[PDB]
Amino acid sequence: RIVEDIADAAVIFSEARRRQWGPTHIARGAALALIGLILVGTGLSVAHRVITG
Amino acid sequence: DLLGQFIVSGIALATVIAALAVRNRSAVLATSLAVTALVPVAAAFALGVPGDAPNVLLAAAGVAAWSLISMAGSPDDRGIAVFTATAVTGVGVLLVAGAASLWVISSDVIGCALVLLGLIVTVQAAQLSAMWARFPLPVIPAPGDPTPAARPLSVLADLPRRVRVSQAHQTGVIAAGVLLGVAGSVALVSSANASPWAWYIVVAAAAGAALRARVWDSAACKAWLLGHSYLLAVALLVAFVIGDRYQAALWALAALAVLVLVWIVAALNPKIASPDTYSLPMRRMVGFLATGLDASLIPVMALLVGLFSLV
Amino acid sequence: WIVAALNPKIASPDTYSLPMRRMVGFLATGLDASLIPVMALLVGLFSLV
Amino acid sequence: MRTEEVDAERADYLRYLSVVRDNVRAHAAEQRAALEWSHPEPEVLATIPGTRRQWERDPRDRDFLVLRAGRHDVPLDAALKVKDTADEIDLEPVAHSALRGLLDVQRTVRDAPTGLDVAKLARITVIGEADEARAAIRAWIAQAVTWHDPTMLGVALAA
Amino acid sequence: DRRSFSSRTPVNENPDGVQYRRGFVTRHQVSGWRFVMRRIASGVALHDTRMLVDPLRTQSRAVLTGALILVTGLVGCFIFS
Amino acid sequence: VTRHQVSGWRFVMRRIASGVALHDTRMLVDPLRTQSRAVLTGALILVTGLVGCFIFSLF
Amino acid sequence: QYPDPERPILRVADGRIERWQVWQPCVDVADAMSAAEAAHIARRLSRW
């Protein structure tokens, strides 16, 4: 296709993106947050001992 | 000794030329080499400056130059957000480091400068991208008779490439925005038992980020935005432990726990992350709130840095 | 003068933005506007009243 | 009466324009669909002599004795007429610019199956290299004979 | 009513019909440019350009208001001395 | 003399000026006018701060 | 004498069929057939 109105020419040629936020990126966000939390708590106590008592 | 710098210089020059040489055949190895090429260059142009900051300045200039000259000489993509973000953050840190090096700085003005630069770049992110994409600028005519020519079909056949490049640039710009928006906000509160206006500033900037993420639509951009509070929390945590305090660290963990709790209760509950099920007045109030936050930011920043006190 | 002599795209006001050549207007309005009160300072008229 | 209102009106007109562009693109889709249906590429015609579409061309149909030769820009037979009634009144710049930039690129279909009709030619004379000619000749002559009843049109040769 | 004269412009068909070369951005042109660049810049962040509510300009004018109130308080306490 | 009669006069004796320095009489936008009020207002900022500082000693 | 649209003149370029008017390519990608292809066409069609 050929479009000249740059407004549509951007709101049309950016749909090869599956960009929909939707209720599925929320899952990976929650999961990786949880994983980081667990690891950082453990490593926090790790360094807490490798540097103090 | 010096040999630690001769090695860096040689490796970095070799990588520069090799990444400039394989562009034509691979176009995929080329960009990986280009990305890794800016870790040694900054080492050589900073440690190469003898001293302790009067040295980060040249490193920032080097990464900015390398990023800029590699992004332009590139195909459609893979010059992804990584390059533009390095470029913007290098330019900002160079601007701030010059003032820090040639003059004296309270080591708090630094935090003010960085949070300001981050807020500025984030707020004016889109326009800057549309600039860097080099769109076909409008042709607004006078009410006389300079009846202009229609755009040739060539530039209209080249447009889908520019659109993707625009999306990429704007993601990268937001990335560097949050990256600096935390790179200062951590150098602020962590120093040694500072003023509560710093507390309100960091929480205001975090809420301003997390409230901007209702604007954009590219998922990666929204993720970068929402993640600023999280990255801030973890950076404070490690700066505390290395700061040798061991008291509010567990408080940072408490905060991070609330963050992941709200994340979870939002995750398996597709009735709170749904803007439709809410009310119009609440939408309007959230908007007014997001306006009020970043409105209030700059005056309270000036108060905190103390320029109402010089006068 | 030289870089604008042998390079006929900097001395043609058509190839700039619309809002960039806009502000140059503001700049050229402020500069001559401030010029009279600044003279009052230098001459030291304010040290008489 | 300051810039806000005129900008609102600008935005409204541009939205209307987007709608019209979508509609005319649908019309162009119909047109290219039909023209591809009735003059397929000179390889599919190997499969046509079998199925029930071989003598599917009749003297009442809009495509009759039309011989395809290639692809180029067909001018979109639909109308696209605006009802301009002004005596050189000055129209808003940022709207008129958009409409003008529309009425020139969405008026001609992109590469579409052309038509070398022979119902009103009575003589064709090609010029140029030997077999490049006999190519297009054999091409449209087969495309002609394949669609129309052998009891309706005749061909003659001398070589 | 007041019998207004809507702006008009015909042709020329003579010698003085292609001699002016005067580049001067009129108010309308700068308004139009502002609007176009704020309808593109809202087509790569919102992914719809019906332009009913623009929050980007809202953000930018908010930070501007912060700056202006900053300078206002600055001088209003500079007069304090 | 109504204002329309004077609102007219200053307009024609500006359309003439744009005539001989700008070489176009469309008068869509005229920097010469800006040139006038700019240097003009820098006189006012003087005269007011003149008054505002004369009154400053009046405490 | 400005050839009539009927009984016209046609020149065959590499992929053009350029009409004769005063060069108005009139086709930008031409449809060309091969000999053996037409042979197989005739063969198939002689059946019904």
D-chain residues within 8 Å CB-CB of E28?
93
Give the distance from residue E37's alpha carbon to the nearest chain C alpha carbon, in angstroms: 11
Min distance A31 CA to chain B CA atoms (Å):
8
Residue D77 φ then ψ, to 5°: -45, -20
Angle of CA points B96, B97, B99, to nearest 5°: 70
Is the minimum CB–CB distance between F31 and chain E shorter than 8 Å? yes
CB-count burial class (<10 Å; 0-12, 13-18, 19+) for B294: buried
- Cα–Cα distance for residue pair C7/C27, rounded to 1 Å: 25
Residue entry with tokens 């560097």: B176
Burial of D40 (0-12, 13-18, 19+ CB in 10 A): middle
Rounded Cα distance, B115 and B121, in Å: 10
The identity of residue D6, as a single letter, is V
Q: Please report, for chain E, the start and end positions of each structural domain, with discontinuous segments joined by +.
A: 1-81
Rounded Cα–Cα distance for residues D40 and D34 (Å): 10
Judge residue B139's burial from the number of C-beta atoms within 10 Å of its C-beta, 0-12 exposed, 13-18 middle, 19 or more buried: middle
Euclidean distance between CA atoms A16 and A12, whole angstroms: 9
**Closest residue of D to A11, CA-based?**
D18
Contacting residues for C22 by C-beta, under 8 A, at least 6 apart: E25, E30
With CB atoms and an 8 Å threshold, state whether F28 touches E26: yes
Give me Rg for the CA atoms of chain B. Answer: 23
CB-based contact G48 D49, cutoff 8 Å:
yes
**Data resolution in angstroms:** 3.7
C-beta of residue D104 within 8 angstroms of C-beta of residue B150: yes
With both helix axes pointing from N to C terminus, report the angle between A22-51 and B249-267 in degrees, rounded to the nearest 10.
160
DSSP B24: T
Q: Which chains contact C through at least 3 pairs of Cβ atoms less than 8 Å apart?
A: E, F
Question: Nearest-CA distance from F24 to chain E in Å?
Answer: 7
Determine contact, residues B305/B108, Cβ cutoff 8 Å. Answer: yes
Q: How far is A19 from chain E (nearest CA, A)?
A: 10
Biggest CA pair distance of chain D: 80
What crossing angle do the helices spanning D93-102 and D3-38 adopt, rounded to 10°?
Answer: 0
Structure tokens at A16: 């090869």
**Cβ of residue B273 closer than 8 Å to a chain A Cβ:** yes
In the three-class reduction of DSSP (H, G, I as helix; E, B as strand; rest coil), residue B146 is classed as coil
Nearest to B298 by CA among E43, E64, F54: E64
Q: Round to whole Å and give the CA distance between D7 and B157.
A: 30
D89: phi then psi, degrees, rounded to nearest 5: -70, 155
Task: Please report all neighbours of F, defined by 3+ CB atom pairs within 8 A.
Answer: B, C, E
Q: B178 Cβ partners below 8 Å, 6+ apart?
A: B118, B122, B209, B224, B225, B227, B228, B231
CA distance D1 to B139: 25
Which segments of chain C does DSSP mark as H helices, in order? 2-5, 20-33, 35-43
DSSP per-residue string spanning D108-121: S-SEEE--EE-TTT
Place of tokens 């995929």: B28
DSSP for B187-241, please give it: HHHTTTT--HHHHHHHHHHHHHHHHHTTT--SHHHHHHHHHHHHHHHHHHHHHHH
Which among D126, D139, D134 is positioned nearest to G9, based on CA atoms? D126
Report CA torsion sign: B165, B167, B170, B176: negative
Q: Per DSSP, what are the bridge partners of residue D72?
A: D112
Scanning the structure block, which residue is given the tokens 């549509």?
A8
The residue among B85, B174, B169 whose CA lies nearest residue B134 is B169
Is beta strand D66-67 parallel, antiparallel or unpaired with respect to G17-19? unpaired
Contacts of E16 (CB under 8 A, 6+ apart): none
Looking up tokens 């809507």 gives E6
Distance CA E23, CA C12 (A): 10
* Substitution target from C29, C38, C39, C42 for chain F, most F beta carbons within 10 A: C29
Q: How far apart are CA A19 and CA B171, in angstroms?
A: 13
Q: Within 10 A of F50 (CB to CB), how many other CB atoms are there?
A: 16
CB-based contact E23:B113 (threshold 8 Å): no
Cβ pairs bridging B and F (under 8 Å): 3
Which chain A residues have a beta carbon less than 8 Å from that of D101?
A: 4-5
Cβ A7–E44 below 8 Å, yes or no?
no
How far, in Å, are B17, D90, D93, D99, E32 from residue D103 at the CA level?
50, 19, 16, 6, 21
Tokens representing residue D95 in the block: 């709207």
Lookup result for tokens 């490798």: A50
For D111, the token pair is 């590469």
Beta bridge partners of D127: G11
Residue D97's closest CA among E39, C38, B34?
A: E39
Q: Does F23 touch chain E (CB under 8 A)?
A: yes
> Distance (Å, rounded) from C-alpha F28 to C-alpha D133?
62
| DSSP-based helix, strand, coil % in chain G, nearest 5 | 25, 20, 60
Quickly count: other Cβ atoms within 10 Å of residue G27's Cβ: 23
Q: Which amino acid is at B282?
A: M
Q: How far apart are CA B295 and CA B290, in angstroms?
A: 9
List Cβ<8 Å contacts ≥24 apart for B17-23.
B19/B70, B23/B73
- Is the sign of the CA dihedral D131, D134, D136, D138 positive or negative? negative
Q: Which residue has the tokens 């929204």?
A: B222
Q: Which residues of A touch B (CB under 8 A)?
A: 2-4, 6, 9-10, 13-14, 17, 19-21, 23, 25-27, 29-30, 33-34, 36-37, 40-41, 44, 47-48, 51-52
For residue B138, give how far its alpha carbon lies from the nearest alpha carbon of chain D (Å): 9
> What residues of chain D lie within 8 A of the CB of B153, using their CB?
105
Residues in chain F closer than 8 A to B143 (CB atoms): 28
Name the residue among E42, D104, D12, D80 with its Cα closest to residue A8.
E42
Kindly determine whether residue F57 and residue C49, on different chains, have CB atoms separated by under 8 Å: yes
| Whether E51 and D90 lie within 8 Å, measured CB to CB | no
**Rounded CA gap, G26 and B262, in Å?**
66
Q: What CA–CA distance (Å, rounded) separates G24 from G10?
A: 11
Angstrom distance (rounded) from CA D155 to CA F21: 78
Chosen for mutation from A13, A48, A50 (greatest number of chain B CBs closer than 10 Å) is A13
Q: What does the alpha-carbon distance between residue D4 and residue D150 come to, in Å, rounded to a whole number?
A: 70
Long-range contacts from D21-28, C-beta under 8 angstroms, 24+ separation: D21/A5, D21/A8, D21/D102, D21/D106, D24/D78, D24/D80, D24/D106, D25/A1, D25/D106, D27/D76, D27/D78, D28/D76, D28/D106, D28/D109
Give the whole-angstrom CA distance, residue B96 versus residue F54: 43
Question: Taking the CB of residue B298, how many other CB atoms lie within 10 A of it?
Answer: 23
Residue F56 DSSP code: T
- State how far the alpha carbon of B167 is from the alpha carbons of A24, B83, B133, E56, in Å: 21, 14, 9, 16
Interface with F, mutate which of E16, E21, E22 (most F CBs under 10 A): E22
Number of H helices, E strands in chain G: 1, 3
**Matching residue, tokens 């889908």:** B160
Task: Sort strands D116-117 and D125-127 into parallel, antiparallel or unpaired.
Answer: unpaired
CA–CA separation, E43 and B218 (whole Å): 12
Q: Is B214 exposed, middle or buried (0-12, 13-18, 19+ CB in 10 A)?
A: middle
CB atoms within 10 A of CB B29: 13
For D73, the 3-state DSSP assignment is: strand
DSSP B148: P
Size of interface D-G (CB pairs under 8 A): 98
Distance of alpha carbon B290 from its chain centroid, rounded? Answer: 20
Q: Measured between alpha carbons, how far is D94 from B257 in angstroms, rounded to an integer?
A: 52
C-alpha span between D80 and D14 (Å, rounded)? 17
Helix (H, G, I), strand (E, B) or coil at B306: coil
C13 and E23 within 8 Å at the Cβ level: the answer is yes
Q: Residues, chain D, total?
A: 159
Whole-angstrom distance, CA of residue B13 vs CA of residue A32: 38
What are the angstrom distances between the C-alpha of E16 and each of B76, D20, D60, E20, G6? 49, 39, 58, 9, 45
Residue showing tokens 């003032």: B99
With 0-12 CB in 10 A as exposed, 13-18 as middle and 19+ as buried, what is E37? buried
d(CA E20, CA F23): 8
Distance from C-alpha of B260 to C-alpha of A31, rounded to nearest angstrom: 9
At B110 the three-state DSSP class reads: helix
How is residue F36 written in tokens?
Answer: 């006038």
Q: At what angle do helices B3-21 and B29-36 cross, to 10 degrees?
A: 150
DSSP states along F9-46: HHHHHHHHHHHHHHS----SS-HHHHHHHHHHHHHHHH
Label residue D90 left, alpha or beta by phi (over 0 means left) and psi (-120 to 50 means alpha). Answer: beta
- Residue E34 CA to residue E57 CA, distance in Å, equals 11
SS3 at position D59: coil
CB atoms within 10 A of CB B27: 12
Question: Which residue of B123, B129, B212, B283 to mutate against E (max E Cβ within 10 Å)?
Answer: B123
Cα distance between residue B95 and residue B107, in whole Å: 15
Residue type at B292? G
Sign for the CA dihedral angle at D92, D95, D98, D99 comes to: negative
With CA atoms as reference, the chain F residue closest to C29 would be F38
Sign of CA dihedral D48, D54, D56, D58: positive
F38 to chain C, any CB pair closer than 8 A? The answer is yes
The sign of the CA dihedral G38, G40, G43, G47 is: negative
